[PDB]
Amino acid sequence: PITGLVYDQRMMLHHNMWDSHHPELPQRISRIFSRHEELRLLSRCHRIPARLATEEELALCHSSKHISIIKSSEHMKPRDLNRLGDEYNSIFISNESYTCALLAAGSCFNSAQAILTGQVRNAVAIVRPPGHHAEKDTACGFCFFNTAALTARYAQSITRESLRVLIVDWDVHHGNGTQHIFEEDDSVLYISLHRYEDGAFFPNSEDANYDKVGLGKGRGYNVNIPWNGGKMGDPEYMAAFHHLVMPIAREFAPELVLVSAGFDAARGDPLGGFQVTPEGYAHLTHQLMSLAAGRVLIILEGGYNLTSISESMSMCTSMLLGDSPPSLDHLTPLKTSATVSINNVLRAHAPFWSSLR
Ligand SMILES: CN1CC2(CCN(Cc3ccc(C(=O)NO)cc3)CC2)c2ccccc21
Ligand SMILES: [K+]
Numbered sequence: 001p002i003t004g005l006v007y008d009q010r011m012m013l014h015h016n017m018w019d020s021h022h023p024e025l026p027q028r029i030s031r032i033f034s035r036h037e038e039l040r041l042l043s044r045c046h047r048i049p050a051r052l053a054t055e056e057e058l059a060l061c062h063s064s065k066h067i068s069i070i071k072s073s074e075h076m077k078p079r080d081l082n083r084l085g086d087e088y089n090s091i092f093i094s095n096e097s098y099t100c101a102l103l104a105a106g107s108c109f110n111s112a113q114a115i116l117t118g119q120v121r122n123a124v125a126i127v128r129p130p131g132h133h134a135e136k137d138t139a140c141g142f143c144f145f146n147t148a149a150l151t152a153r154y155a156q157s158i159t160r161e162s163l164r165v166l167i168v169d170w171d172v173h174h175g176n177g178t179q180h181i182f183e184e185d186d187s188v189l190y191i192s193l194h195r196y197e198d199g200a201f202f203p204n205s206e207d208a209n210y211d212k213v214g215l216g217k218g219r220g221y222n223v224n225i226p227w228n229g230g231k232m233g234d235p236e237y238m239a240a241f242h243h244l245v246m247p248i249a250r251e252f253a254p255e256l257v258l259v260s261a262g263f264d265a266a267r268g269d270p271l272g273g274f275q276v277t278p279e280g281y282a283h284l285t286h287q288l289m290s291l292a293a294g295r296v297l298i299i300l301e302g303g304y305n306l307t308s309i310s311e312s313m314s315m316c317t318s319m320l321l322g323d324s325p326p327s328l329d330h331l332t333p334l335k336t337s338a339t340v341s342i343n344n345v346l347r348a349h350a351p352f353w354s355s356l357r
């Protein structure tokens with residue numbers, strides 16, 4: 001029963017040279033790492049080295065053209081970096097961005113391998129830039145390569161093609177890239193909870209709605225839990241897990257659980273507008289630990305309040321280490337629109353999951 005931790009200060013080198021105050025700050029990962037030390041969680045984890053993802057590994061999910069374009073930014077002049085950035089939705093690029101994206105991907109590969117070989121039971125990856133918005137052919141929403149999707153394929157590549165991977169995406173944004181990459185795949189189950197507001201919340205696509213259940217063989221293996229009607233918090237996320245995430249996950253019976261763990265639904269996030277507490281995230285973590293014989297990898301995605309993300313991810317690691325979950329306040333009355341959301345997801349997926357009937 002060992003917990004791995006991967007963190008490399010080199011991933012701070014990715015920066016926005018046109019707005020040094022952009023919220024995807026290098027200090028996101030250094031502040032999370034610092035808090036793990038202060039709380040004395042770091043000395044209880046087995047440290048896992050970062051490594052560069054290879055170009056071949058990037059090809060598990062991404063087109064050669066997308067790879068070589070991002071690769072080329074490494075030697076671009078500032079004017080070319082600025083032009084290239086404007087060809088994507090919400091992307092800034094510096095000369096170090098490509099290397100940082102490879103470091104984030106490879107760090108998760110080493111973690112998945114450590115888990116799947118039994119060197120550790122579970123693991124946390126404190127990495128940036130994030131991944132879940134990145135598509136097969138394009139970068140998007142602060143993300144260059146889809147770190148979680150690549151780690152799922154990497155895990156299958158060192159075990160077997162049909163390794164059942166669950167990706168739980170609790171970042172406040174829909175992970176459009178992860179959904180699309182696995183949309184017709186029945187070996188990777190994708191479950192996303194996200195602020196939706198009938199398509200008005202980033203990334204502003206109806207792909208995020210509850211009726212997108214997957215395609216062909218992948219029907220039923222894409223689960224969108226969209227929130228409408230303003231602020232959500234622990235009661236709604238607890239109920240989504242109890243009524244949807246955990247019943248479906250148990251029926252799927254993953255052999256590995258990847259968490260796309262953005263912490264931008266946390267209280268205090270300047271962008272998410274939600275109220276999930278660190279104790280809330282501890283409890284979501286604890287529940288997922290009941291799956292896949294405990295084989296859980298937590299991968300940092302978004303999250304923009306330096307204190308909120310540092311307290312929230314620390315609590316998750318605390319859970320992975322075996323600590324007992326902190327008490328929760330008043331989970332009872334959900335917002336009406338959240339009950340409606342959960343009922344829409346239940347109606348969408350009951351055809352595919354007997355546990356929902
Ligand atoms: C009407 N909006 C405003 C907005 C401005 C910039 N933010 C960028 C962004 C991306 C990812 C994450 C994250 O944390 N993902 O997990 C957080 C912020 C998004 C929304 C935008 C961009 C493009 C088109 C339309 C619009
Ligand atoms: K999400």
Ligand SMILES: [K+]
Nearest residue numbers: 182185188221
């Ligand atoms: K899928």
Ligand SMILES: [Zn+2]
Nearest residue numbers: 171173264302
């Ligand atoms: Zn996000």
